[PDB]
């Protein structure tokens, strides 16, 4: 009776779909026709971070909105001062194929990982590796810090894992996704976190109970970018179908779809502004687009790079934005 | 406010030291040529190079550093990964060359190797990176075609009408070998705006000339790239 369970899952999914269609009172696009749009937005390159040898793959801003970490595919983790452009630390990575990096909220530790299937923690306030969390059977795609003691990591084995830094063991594991999980984003209340996989599904997870709370299947291609709203109730996702989708944790369905027929390339990074009015998404057309989170129209284009933008980061206050591409240069926009 | 200029100049000194370290590392970065290695489990990609100077085993990657004619080569083999490889392969869009080892002896798994070669060749990001073809295990294929127990016609009917090319430089053994070569080439020549080409080379598991072959192929690759940069090709 396996096909019986198949149709049970099918009818449960149909129930969920019809329930989501029932609460669909309207679309936020037609609701936002009463407010004035953001209009044209233009940003200029303030600083150009040079020094990376190979292609940059990930970046993350600190809570001080001053120092930023950046990982390059030549095996280098460089900390840059956004105000003075001078480098603070340059950690040589043991495995050159790094795909993710993280900055702790306290600014004392930094995370790294990649094809080596090991999450390395480096202490900046000692520089050497503090711990090497191993056990994943896939490549580290994204890493984020919950505290100075726990750390969430995303691996290519369709599983996510919250590790304890001092213990070095899997405090919690999540085995829900069916495809390679590409990126995750922590909520401002640090209790929930959303994660998008190579499948068309993005799942919300709890750090306490350790299970999937909600699931979103609005996308159609490999979900590579993800970011939560500053309030913690919504989150945007990006996939290779040249389409961004904004989902709500409470509505449990898609709210807005940002796309353009002229944009046919994939998306790499997605993030919100301080107030969440703008949505900066880097595409494979060698640039980034700033959509209106309420109007769904491209307000500005940042094309200072010469290759596909790999990582995009906004400060805690929204004072400046950083875009790292495969041309081994980071562009700071303001 | 001397404490502020002091800390700023200390930061500038640290940046100077970091820039010196990066400039020193740039030499060893440009001195080594990164190479990708791919192939199924049946392929002998693990022992494809016999002139390996150092062979390190990382947590999930096998690194092979070897020097030919004072030119370094740092090949990577990604085996400790899942079957889904459409994402991390984009990490290897900056390698000098890709070596896709194919076990030309087996016929049933040859279609899987052909599909893998077609997917790697038609990649959006790997279009500027060439793929070197090494048909390993020629002795097994030769013994198989000489035994006559397993015929290629059961898996590839075109071999019934195919014949050895006129430019063959060595009969059924060479016929099947050149048939596999042309079957891989027609997939390689099916796409690409001249920015990358495939270099087929017939090698055995006991052949020690693989290092020189890779050296010459990489030299030709970079030479053709420089020629295309100057509108000379």
């Amino acid at each position, epitope marked *: 009776e396996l096909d019986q369970l198949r149709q049970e899952a099918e009818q449960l*999914k149909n129930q969920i779909r019809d329930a989501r269609k029932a609460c669909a009172d309207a679309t936020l696009s037609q609701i936002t026709n009463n407010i004035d749009p953001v209009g044209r937005i233009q940003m200029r390159t303030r600083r150009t971070l040079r020094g990376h040898l190979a292609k940059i793959y990930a970046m993350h801003w600190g809570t001080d909105s001053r120092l930023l970490v950046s990982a390059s595919q030549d095996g280098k983790l460089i900390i840059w001062d956004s105000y003075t452009t001078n480098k603070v630390h340059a950690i040589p990575l043991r495995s050159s194929w790094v795909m993710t990096c993280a900055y702790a909220p306290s600014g004392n530790y930094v995370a790294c990982g990649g094809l080596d299937n090991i999450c390395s923690i480096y202490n900046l306030k000692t520089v050497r590796v503090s711990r090497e969390l191993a056990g994943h059977t896939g490549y580290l795609s994204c890493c984020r810090f919950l505290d100075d003691n726990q750390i969430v990591t995303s691996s290519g084995d369709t599983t996510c894992a919250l590790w304890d830094i001092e213990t070095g063991q899997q405090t919690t594991t999540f085995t829900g996704h069916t495809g390679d999980v590409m990126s995750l984003s922590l909520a401002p209340d640090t209790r929930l976190f959303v994660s998008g996989a190579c*499948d068309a*599904s993005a799942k919300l997870w709890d750090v306490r109970e350790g299970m999937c709370r909600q699931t979103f299947t609005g996308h159609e291609s490999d979900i590579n970018a993800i970011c939560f709203f500053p309030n913690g109730n919504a989150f945007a996702t990006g996939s290779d179908d040249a389409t961004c989708r904004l989902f709500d944790l409470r509505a449990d369905q898609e709210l807005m779809t940002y796309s353009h027929d002229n944009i*046919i390339c994939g998306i790499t990074s997605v993030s919100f502004s301080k107030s969440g009015r703008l949505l900066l998404a880097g595409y494979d057309d060698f640039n980034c687009n700033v959509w209106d989170a309420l109007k769904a129209d491209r307000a500005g284009v940042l094309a200072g790079h010469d290759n596909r933008v790999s990582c995009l980061g906004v400060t805690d206050d929204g004072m400046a934005v950083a875009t790292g591409s495969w041309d081994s240069f980071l562009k700071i926009w303001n | 406010t001397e404490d502020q200029r002091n800390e700023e100049k200390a930061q500038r000194e640290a940046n100077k030291m970091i820039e010196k370290q990066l400039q020193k590392d740039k030499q060893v970065y440009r001195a080594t040529h990164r190479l990708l290695l791919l192939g199924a489990d049946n392929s002998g990609k693990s022992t494809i190079v016999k002139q390996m100077r150092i062979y390190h085993v990382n947590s999930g990657i096998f690194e092979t550093k070897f020097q030919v004619d004072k030119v370094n080569f740092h090949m990577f083999d990604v085996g400790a990964q899942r*079957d*889904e490889r*459409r994402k991390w392969i984009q990490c290897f869009n900056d390698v000098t060359a890709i070596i896709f080892v194919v076990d030309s002896s087996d016929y049933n798994r040859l*279609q899987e190797a052909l*599909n893998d070669f077609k997917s790697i060749w038609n990649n959006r990001w790997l279009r500027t990176i060439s793929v070197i073809l090494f048909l390993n295990k020629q002795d097994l294929l030769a013994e198989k075609v000489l035994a006559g127990k397993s015929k290629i016609e059961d*898996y590839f009917p075109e071999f019934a009408r195919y014949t050895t090319p006129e430019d063959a430089t060595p009969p059924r053994v060479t016929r099947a070998k050149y048939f596999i070569r042309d079957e891989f080439l027609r997939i390689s020549t099916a796409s690409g705006d001249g920015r990358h080409y495939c270099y087929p080379h017939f090698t055995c598991s006991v052949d020690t000339e693989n290092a020189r072959r890779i050296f010459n192929d990489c030299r030709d690759i970079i030479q053709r790239m420089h020629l295309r940069q100057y509108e000379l090709l």
Partner: nanobody, 128 residues
Framework: QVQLQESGGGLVQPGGSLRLSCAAS????????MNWVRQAPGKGLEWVSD????????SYTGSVKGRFTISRDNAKNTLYLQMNSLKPEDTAVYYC?????????????????????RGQGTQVTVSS
């Protein structure tokens, strides 16, 4: 939500003809490349045929070259595979596979064990 539902199958006599259809929902079917795979009892997945977005490029493997044919209708979001000259060893469960990226030509994980953008397949038995 991405959903691929295949119809037909069952048991068919060898040497006859059969038709397998596939309906797609949750995306734009006209923008993605399609492939057909088959899994035999005690064997791995086996790609048999592919088809592009507008059908400009169609290819099959050497084992089913000519005898099998494939087509697609974007106005109905449907895929069709007509099967002829069936042999007893060619029995397998057939699955559909969608291109991970729209309007591309690099299909990497279509034969992967746990691919997400694939159907659950139909059982196809052939025996006398």
């Amino acid at each position: 939500q991405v959903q691929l539902q295949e119809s037909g199958g069952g048991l068919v006599q060898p040497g006859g003809s059969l038709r397998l259809s596939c309906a797609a929902s949750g995306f734009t079917f006209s923008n993605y490349k399609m492939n057909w795979v088959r899994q035999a009892p005690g064997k791995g997945l086996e790609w048999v045929s592919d088809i592009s977005q507008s059908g400009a490029s169609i290819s099959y493997t050497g084992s089913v070259k000519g005898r099998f044919t494939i087509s697609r209708d974007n106005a109905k979001n449907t895929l069709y595979l007509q099967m002829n000259s069936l042999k007893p060893e060619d029995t397998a469960v057939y699955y559909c596979a969608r291109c991970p990226a729209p309007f591309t030509r690099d299909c990497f994980d279509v034969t992967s064990t746990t691919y997400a953008y694939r159907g659950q397949g139909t059982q196809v038995t052939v025996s006398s």
